[PDB]
Amino acid sequence: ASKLRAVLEKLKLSRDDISTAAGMVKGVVDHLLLRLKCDSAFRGVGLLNTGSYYEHVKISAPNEFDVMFKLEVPRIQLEEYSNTRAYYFVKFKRNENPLSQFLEGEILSASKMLSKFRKIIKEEINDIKDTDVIMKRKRGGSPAVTLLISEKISVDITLALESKSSWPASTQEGLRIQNWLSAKVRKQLRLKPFYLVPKHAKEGNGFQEETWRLSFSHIEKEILNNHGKSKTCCENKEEKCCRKDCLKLMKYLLEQLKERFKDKKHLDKFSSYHVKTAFFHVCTQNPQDSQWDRKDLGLCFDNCVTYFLQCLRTEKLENYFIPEFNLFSSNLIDKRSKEFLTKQIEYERNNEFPVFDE
Ligand SMILES: Nc1nc(=O)c2ncn([C@@H]3O[C@@H]4COP(=O)(O)O[C@H]5[C@@H](O)[C@H](n6cnc7c(N)ncnc76)O[C@@H]5COP(=O)(O)O[C@@H]3[C@@H]4O)c2[nH]1
Ligand SMILES: [Zn+2]
């Protein structure tokens, strides 16, 4: 526990780097919001509130940042890419929109949208003269256009259609927070927009470049900051839970494991979204603030680690919002690599976590 307090103390020692670093990110992002609004399609574009540093800037890892550009898109009609409960075709309600230039039938093409997004951004980068910034569009069908700044700091930018209609059927039994946050809050949250991002649905070898995927990062941000059964959790000397510290340690335990196997990238498919998602399932499972007292940090950390282990062991980690979307299927992650991480976390848990030593 005091070993873990030590670990949290160290992480705090870099709270000011990711302060100044994030101020660069916010600075560049604003340049983009200007040029994109000039375009007719992306006219009503704006920043989505998903991050802690500077209100729109999310931190996934040290020196990795994350921004969502939301775009209001009236009259959405969804067609599920069937049996893949998170992936959707997108249609307008038949009568005209400016997004017209991206249709492929009755369908809004994701990659067609993504392509113009990119040329607009790549064009602003080829113009700015103060800083050296570059493009890194590399990874496997990601919706993220990724900028790199002064060879140190990297930003994921995501286009996000905003639908203000009722969440789709695949989320009906998701966001199971009624025991934790309340039936009341779940109705409030599920009244809020949802977002579609242009991560395409695989077709085996390639993709289906007209399919979007659901996102709820703004809900994730809210249930992280408004995290207690008590409405006054973490607001006074008497209600200090360790919920946020427990998510930080989990994210950090994954990053340290990832460095140790930097040789062959044996764990490269694991992700802080996996640790976050699993941490939400624990909160659902332990709903009371009494179950996250601050002086019980070591116990709470174990609770998080075992459920993660169990998720790796069972090859099942449900998306928090779409219960039939299994982030740990073999569609997505090989049997072999999940075995790998179970062995290394199991050992880490059984020996007071030597990965956190000096
Ligand atoms: N900035 C950003 N926002 C996204 O929504 C997102 N979705 C994918 N990616 C990247 O595309 C690639 C494809 O991974 P896949 O989608 O098959 O599994 C993903 C994805 O299902 C899930 N995930 C990550 N972010 C989100 C998110 N905001 N909403 C839902 N699921 C997410 O966790 C898995 C690990 O992905 P990452 O390894 O962290 O980055 C992925 C990866 O590079 C994203 N990058
Ligand atoms: Zn709290």
Curated annotation (Swiss-Prot):
Presence of keyword Transmembrane helix: no
GO molecular function terms noted in the UniProt entry: 2',3'-cyclic GMP-AMP synthase activity; ATP binding; chromatin binding; DNA binding; double-stranded DNA binding; GTP binding; metal ion binding; molecular condensate scaffold activity
Site note Arginine-anchor, residues: R94
Membrane-related topology note: Peripheral membrane protein
Result after altering T50Q: Abolishes enzyme activity
Major localization listed first in the record, in broad terms: nucleus
Documented effect of changing H227A: Strongly reduces stimulation of interferon production
Residues at which ATP binds: S52, E64, F65, D66, S217, H218, I219, E220, K251, S272, Y273, H274, V275, K276
Outcome of substituting K187A: Impaired association with collided ribosomes in response to translation stress. Does not affect interaction with histones H2A and H2B
Outcome when changing K251R: Reduced enzyme activity. Decreased ubiquitination and SQSTM1-mediated autophagic degradation
Name of protein: Cyclic GMP-AMP synthase
Species this chain originates from: Homo sapiens (Human)
